Amino acid sequence: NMQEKGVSEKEILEELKKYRSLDLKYEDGNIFGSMCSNVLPITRKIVDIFLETNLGDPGLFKGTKLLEEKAVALLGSLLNNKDAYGHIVSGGTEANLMALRCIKNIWREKRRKGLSKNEHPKIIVPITAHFSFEKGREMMDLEYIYAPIKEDYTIDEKFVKDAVEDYDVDGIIGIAGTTELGTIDNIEELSKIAKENNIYIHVDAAFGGLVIPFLDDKYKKKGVNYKFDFSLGVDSITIDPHKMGHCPIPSGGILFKDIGYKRYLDVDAPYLQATILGTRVGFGGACTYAVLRYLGREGQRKIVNECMENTLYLYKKLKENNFKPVIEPILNIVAIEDEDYKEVCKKLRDRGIYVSVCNCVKALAIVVMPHIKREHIDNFIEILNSIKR
Amino acid sequence: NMQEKGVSEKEILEELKKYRSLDLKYEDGNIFGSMCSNVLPITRKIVDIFLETNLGDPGLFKGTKLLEEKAVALLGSLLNNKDAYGHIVSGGTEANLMALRCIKNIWREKRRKGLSKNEHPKIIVPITAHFSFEKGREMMDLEYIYAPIKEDYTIDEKFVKDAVEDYDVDGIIGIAGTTELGTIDNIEELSKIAKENNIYIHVDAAFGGLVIPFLDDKYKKKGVNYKFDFSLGVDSITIDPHKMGHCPIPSGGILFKDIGYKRYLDVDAPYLQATILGTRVGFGGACTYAVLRYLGREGQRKIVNECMENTLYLYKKLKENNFKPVIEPILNIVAIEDEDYKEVCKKLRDRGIYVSVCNCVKALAIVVMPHIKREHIDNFIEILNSIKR
């Protein structure tokens, strides 16, 4: 209940710390199923410096707004596009929703001209798509053509091509690093289909965008295509600094091929900004720029390939103990086949091991973020073996 | 451009500080038109403690999730509802969008049963509504019936009542503290109309919700109704800690009358959370709870009525200098009539005074947040007099 009298700073901080003590902490070897991790320590100072900024009012924070533009330019350069137009937004969800808004407004323009027989935008989406695409469908009344996945759990490119011939398609979604298994759709083929048919293509690289460009060749697999960025001519890319960019939440990224896409993000206010949010942090842009500058490609390569080394270690231990990984890992994600995954996950949770559950297959998914070290993997294998005894 | 080699912490921090130096700062007497201000200093420690939490994964942060529930309960108690269901979200925009989603899904349920002749939800919205309502309309394909405002710039209640008889209405929006003038719609009458016709009513108290409950009686005006909360039976209320709650961005609030509204926030994921965002900060809930506890009603009353004292001072000086305020202030907002407001605003901006421009009237709007002190108001009056000479 709200009280008349205030309390002391010592009282309220001690209470909050008690609540914090009930949380898990990334560095304690409990969290195995999350795509967030410890932030780069430098970002704590940056959050402090930029706490009292608001990119919803950029005319008041000219320098913080410039840092957002510079963060976007660095991400754009990483993705092979020196002219990208974009924003440092609240996360991959808002990023994906903005792309969907752009796809919808391109369709709206067509409908206004009689150039579309679709009463709602028709968008081809793989069934591996993150839940944010369902939030967008539900809110924006989109019509999704769900694309099946092949045996390697990547989108069926022939289905997409056939569907594009069969229907009037307003967008195609490809995923560069799926949530459950870390697989990479064949963006190169999808972008060829999209370009040939003049269809908008969005790449969801929320997770993979800050991993794929840094992978050592020994982790790359023959036959797997790792191309996903603006070198393929795609229209937009979601990329999430607060996942494998080690930035504090909220630090999401949305990049469009060029500034011509901005007009399709406009909103008509008859009695009255491209982001969905209004008031919004300025420290995400500052952190995204600073972390990429501080690390350079070299520093991020080191972190990414350390994670991959621990990922292949876990893969190795899993097989050595007769567990069946769903696939040989593509990114720093491994999943364990198990018909009894629901209950094994709950048994793991009761022993202090928190994994996530897949949807496209009966399995436990582990995300080997930088906080997962070899000793945590050893401890995980012991606890799981025991659960199975 | 992205570089191979990293840089030192000293290099990147000094660069960021240079960019920060180009920003305005709330405490420097430049910012007059914003509803954000300096955060309560205790929140810097809280942000640090809770930086590495994620309410998108509450199973991993049980204590931070409890603090969100406690923050919501304190806001609910402030709004006369000990059973409110809600969330500490990214801001008033996401809060308003979630309410609109709820209104739409109530309508969808009716449509599924043949109980609605509306092909889209029809929502009565005053023309003073914040831009976030237009974002919701554009994204969710809502049909708005724009309600006119009366001479006191509050919604025309008779129009709403007539419109509700004339049409099948799926929602009503009332504003408790408008963006441009700080006026309070007659929520009591609107809630009576809504209850009698079984129409969902949402109250946008993003700004007013943390001001109105704390106003000293000398600032209240005869004939103005200050009732706006769940004591009126309304369905939902937006309230923004990162405005007059002195909390860091992102700290927005959405409260529903009870937990029965949660099901209308569900999203059907055939191949797979009530917030729009996924990954999201945990420090907003911690800060909202802590600031309300630390201040108590007493501490917030002091800040609110200090602002009102400075608001009426500015009002007094304005008239003393023959400027025409749009209205006698209701909340800590005053606006200055001026046919030449566009250019006067730009002249003010070139002299370091940043105000905002109204849409419903030709005027400059000043928000007297806690960072505005008597000497800033004196300086503002001198600069404006000079601009007029």
Side-chain angles (χ1 to χ4, degrees), chain B residues 55-61 63-69:
Chain B
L55 284 174
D57 217 332
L60 310 180
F61 304 101
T64 297
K65 175 62 185 127
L66 286 173
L67 282 168
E68 182 191 21
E69 295 170 17

mmCIF file of all heavy atoms in Angstrom, chain B residues 55-70, unseen atoms left out:
data_model
loop_
_atom_site.group_PDB
_atom_site.id
_atom_site.type_symbol
_atom_site.label_atom_id
_atom_site.label_comp_id
_atom_site.label_asym_id
_atom_site.label_seq_id
_atom_site.Cartn_x
_atom_site.Cartn_y
_atom_site.Cartn_z
ATOM 1 N N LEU B 55 12.823 -8.647 -17.537
ATOM 2 C CA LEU B 55 11.483 -9.098 -17.228
ATOM 3 C C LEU B 55 10.852 -9.837 -18.389
ATOM 4 O O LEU B 55 9.747 -10.341 -18.240
ATOM 5 C CB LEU B 55 10.588 -7.946 -16.795
ATOM 6 C CG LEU B 55 10.870 -7.489 -15.356
ATOM 7 C CD1 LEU B 55 10.050 -6.276 -15.056
ATOM 8 C CD2 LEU B 55 10.585 -8.589 -14.364
ATOM 9 N N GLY B 56 11.525 -9.913 -19.528
ATOM 10 C CA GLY B 56 11.072 -10.841 -20.551
ATOM 11 C C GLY B 56 11.306 -12.292 -20.190
ATOM 12 O O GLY B 56 10.680 -13.165 -20.785
ATOM 13 N N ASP B 57 12.135 -12.552 -19.187
ATOM 14 C CA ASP B 57 12.435 -13.908 -18.719
ATOM 15 C C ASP B 57 12.262 -13.945 -17.215
ATOM 16 O O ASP B 57 13.221 -14.140 -16.460
ATOM 17 C CB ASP B 57 13.847 -14.318 -19.110
ATOM 18 C CG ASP B 57 13.946 -15.789 -19.504
ATOM 19 O OD1 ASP B 57 13.142 -16.615 -19.003
ATOM 20 O OD2 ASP B 57 14.835 -16.101 -20.315
ATOM 21 N N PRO B 58 11.037 -13.727 -16.743
ATOM 22 C CA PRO B 58 10.823 -13.539 -15.304
ATOM 23 C C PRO B 58 11.113 -14.787 -14.482
ATOM 24 O O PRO B 58 11.361 -14.670 -13.285
ATOM 25 C CB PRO B 58 9.335 -13.149 -15.229
ATOM 26 C CG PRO B 58 8.718 -13.770 -16.455
ATOM 27 C CD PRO B 58 9.778 -13.713 -17.521
ATOM 28 N N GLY B 59 11.067 -15.971 -15.085
ATOM 29 C CA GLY B 59 11.437 -17.174 -14.381
ATOM 30 C C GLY B 59 12.875 -17.173 -13.942
ATOM 31 O O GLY B 59 13.230 -17.899 -13.023
ATOM 32 N N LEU B 60 13.704 -16.324 -14.551
ATOM 33 C CA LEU B 60 15.091 -16.232 -14.136
ATOM 34 C C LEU B 60 15.327 -15.126 -13.121
ATOM 35 O O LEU B 60 16.398 -15.083 -12.508
ATOM 36 C CB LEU B 60 15.987 -16.008 -15.339
ATOM 37 C CG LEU B 60 15.816 -16.928 -16.536
ATOM 38 C CD1 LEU B 60 16.826 -16.474 -17.593
ATOM 39 C CD2 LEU B 60 16.008 -18.398 -16.157
ATOM 40 N N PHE B 61 14.383 -14.211 -12.957
ATOM 41 C CA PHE B 61 14.567 -13.025 -12.102
ATOM 42 C C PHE B 61 13.339 -12.894 -11.213
ATOM 43 O O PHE B 61 12.559 -11.946 -11.298
ATOM 44 C CB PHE B 61 14.834 -11.782 -12.964
ATOM 45 C CG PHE B 61 16.026 -11.944 -13.893
ATOM 46 C CD1 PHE B 61 15.856 -12.227 -15.226
ATOM 47 C CD2 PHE B 61 17.316 -11.841 -13.411
ATOM 48 C CE1 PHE B 61 16.955 -12.403 -16.065
ATOM 49 C CE2 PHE B 61 18.399 -12.007 -14.219
ATOM 50 C CZ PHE B 61 18.226 -12.305 -15.558
ATOM 51 N N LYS B 62 13.174 -13.896 -10.351
ATOM 52 C CA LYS B 62 11.948 -14.007 -9.564
ATOM 53 C C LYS B 62 11.767 -12.777 -8.697
ATOM 54 O O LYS B 62 10.654 -12.265 -8.538
ATOM 55 C CB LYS B 62 11.974 -15.281 -8.729
ATOM 56 N N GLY B 63 12.880 -12.257 -8.155
ATOM 57 C CA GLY B 63 12.759 -11.118 -7.245
ATOM 58 C C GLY B 63 12.452 -9.827 -7.968
ATOM 59 O O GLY B 63 11.665 -9.013 -7.493
ATOM 60 N N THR B 64 13.080 -9.603 -9.125
ATOM 61 C CA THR B 64 12.787 -8.422 -9.933
ATOM 62 C C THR B 64 11.348 -8.469 -10.432
ATOM 63 O O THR B 64 10.684 -7.435 -10.520
ATOM 64 C CB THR B 64 13.785 -8.333 -11.093
ATOM 65 O OG1 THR B 64 15.109 -8.162 -10.595
ATOM 66 C CG2 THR B 64 13.442 -7.165 -12.037
ATOM 67 N N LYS B 65 10.862 -9.658 -10.794
ATOM 68 C CA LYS B 65 9.456 -9.802 -11.166
ATOM 69 C C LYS B 65 8.539 -9.478 -9.981
ATOM 70 O O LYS B 65 7.511 -8.801 -10.134
ATOM 71 C CB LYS B 65 9.219 -11.228 -11.688
ATOM 72 C CG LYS B 65 7.768 -11.602 -12.005
ATOM 73 C CD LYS B 65 7.187 -10.713 -13.118
ATOM 74 C CE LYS B 65 5.684 -10.976 -13.375
ATOM 75 N NZ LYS B 65 4.861 -9.713 -13.316
ATOM 76 N N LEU B 66 8.899 -9.912 -8.778
ATOM 77 C CA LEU B 66 8.086 -9.538 -7.628
ATOM 78 C C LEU B 66 8.061 -8.033 -7.449
ATOM 79 O O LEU B 66 7.012 -7.460 -7.112
ATOM 80 C CB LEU B 66 8.586 -10.216 -6.341
ATOM 81 C CG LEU B 66 8.261 -11.708 -6.230
ATOM 82 C CD1 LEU B 66 8.944 -12.335 -5.013
ATOM 83 C CD2 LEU B 66 6.763 -11.916 -6.154
ATOM 84 N N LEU B 67 9.199 -7.366 -7.660
ATOM 85 C CA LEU B 67 9.198 -5.914 -7.546
ATOM 86 C C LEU B 67 8.305 -5.248 -8.596
ATOM 87 O O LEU B 67 7.719 -4.184 -8.332
ATOM 88 C CB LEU B 67 10.617 -5.362 -7.678
ATOM 89 C CG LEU B 67 11.473 -5.512 -6.440
ATOM 90 C CD1 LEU B 67 12.947 -5.204 -6.762
ATOM 91 C CD2 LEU B 67 10.942 -4.660 -5.298
ATOM 92 N N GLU B 68 8.216 -5.817 -9.804
ATOM 93 C CA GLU B 68 7.280 -5.257 -10.774
ATOM 94 C C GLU B 68 5.850 -5.357 -10.243
ATOM 95 O O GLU B 68 5.075 -4.400 -10.310
ATOM 96 C CB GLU B 68 7.382 -5.969 -12.136
ATOM 97 C CG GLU B 68 6.424 -5.346 -13.157
ATOM 98 C CD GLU B 68 6.241 -6.123 -14.459
ATOM 99 O OE1 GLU B 68 6.503 -7.349 -14.527
ATOM 100 O OE2 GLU B 68 5.822 -5.473 -15.444
ATOM 101 N N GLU B 69 5.477 -6.537 -9.741
ATOM 102 C CA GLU B 69 4.149 -6.708 -9.156
ATOM 103 C C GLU B 69 3.905 -5.734 -8.002
ATOM 104 O O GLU B 69 2.833 -5.128 -7.915
ATOM 105 C CB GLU B 69 3.988 -8.150 -8.700
ATOM 106 C CG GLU B 69 4.017 -9.140 -9.849
ATOM 107 C CD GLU B 69 4.110 -10.596 -9.366
ATOM 108 O OE1 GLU B 69 3.825 -10.865 -8.172
ATOM 109 O OE2 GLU B 69 4.503 -11.463 -10.163
ATOM 110 N N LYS B 70 4.916 -5.514 -7.152
ATOM 111 C CA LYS B 70 4.771 -4.558 -6.060
ATOM 112 C C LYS B 70 4.674 -3.115 -6.554
ATOM 113 O O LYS B 70 3.989 -2.285 -5.946
ATOM 114 C CB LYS B 70 5.963 -4.683 -5.116
ATOM 115 C CG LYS B 70 5.899 -5.829 -4.143
ATOM 116 C CD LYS B 70 7.223 -5.949 -3.342
ATOM 117 C CE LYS B 70 7.184 -5.119 -2.048
#
